[PDB]
Structures are given as structure tokens and as C-alpha cells.
Structure 1
């Protein structure tokens, strides 16, 4: 994720959806206070999100599922 985004593009399929998914996850980690699912190694959140997407731990479906679960839990 530090040089090329080819694995993330392959995981998400579209280069234009990858930016949106990564921006959503990075904003969660930067302001929302969520914790990374991968070992942070002095990386920025923009790169941590892409490294999470490479491992297959994050995509749009997962984010929506977690959002619904969190809202139902808080209700």
C-alpha cells in the first residue's frame, strides 16, 4: 500500500470505489476513535486503511454491517 495500490484495487475491483472506501475507513480511524485491525507500524491512517483492505478485512459490506450492529447496540 506504500508504493502501489494494486492489491487494494483487485480486492475492491474499481479504482474509484477504493478511494471512497479507504476515505471512510481512514476517517473512522482518525476522528471516530476506532482501532486498526492490523499492526500499526508508524503509518498514516490513509495507508493503514489500504493495508487493511489488502488483507480483505474491510470493504463496503463489512463497514455497513458494523455500522448497523453498532447503531443497534447503542439503541
Structure 2
């Protein structure tokens, strides 16, 4: 469990678009479309998204290429 946002601040210096992107990540593993990439500790999707972005696993480029991906499959 990690509720402090310092690592996410360092990874994303704006730390404010950080909120938006982590919120989107949480929004689409909370509802189907993607699945958690970090082991669940009975955590809410907010903090698992936060721990994802802390590890550098989720960044703006990665999330946008991933999302454009799920579209080109959903039209296909």
C-alpha cells in the first residue's frame, strides 16, 4: 500500500495532469477494458493506478499508445 504521491510527482513533474491520467487508468480497470498490472492488496483502483504510475510503468506516452491500441482493436 502507498498513499503518498511523491514518486508520481517525480515521474510526472506537473503532478496535476498526473491526477487526470491516473484517474483514467483507474476508470478503465475499475470497469472492464484493462486489468491491474500490479498485485492487488484489496486496494481501490485509485491506489493501484497510483502504484502503477509510481513504478514508471504508466506514463503519458505509454497510456496514450495503449488507449489508441484498444481502439484499433475495437474498430477491427
Compute the TM-score of the two structures, normalised by the length of structure 1: 0.87
Structure 1 regions of 5+ residues with no counterpart? none
Runs of at least 4 residues off by over 4 Å:
none
Q: CA deviation at 1:74?
A: 2.8
Q: Which string of whole-angstrom CA distances, capped at 9 and with x for unpartnered residues, describes residues 5-56 of structure 1? A: 1001111111211110110000011123421111111111000000000111
Compute the TM-score of the two structures, normalised by the length of structure 2: 0.86
How far apart are the structure 1 equivalents of 2:63 and 2:48?
A: 15
The secondary structure found in structure 2 opposite 1:15 is coil
Structure 2 regions of 5+ residues with no counterpart? none
Q: Aligned pair in 2 of structure 1 residues 66, 33: CA closer, same or farther (>3 Å)?
A: closer
**Aligned partners of 2:3 and 2:47 also within 8 Å:** no
* Greater mean deviation of Cα atoms: 7-16 or 45-54: 7-16
Indicate the RMSD between aligned Cα atoms, in angstroms.
1.5
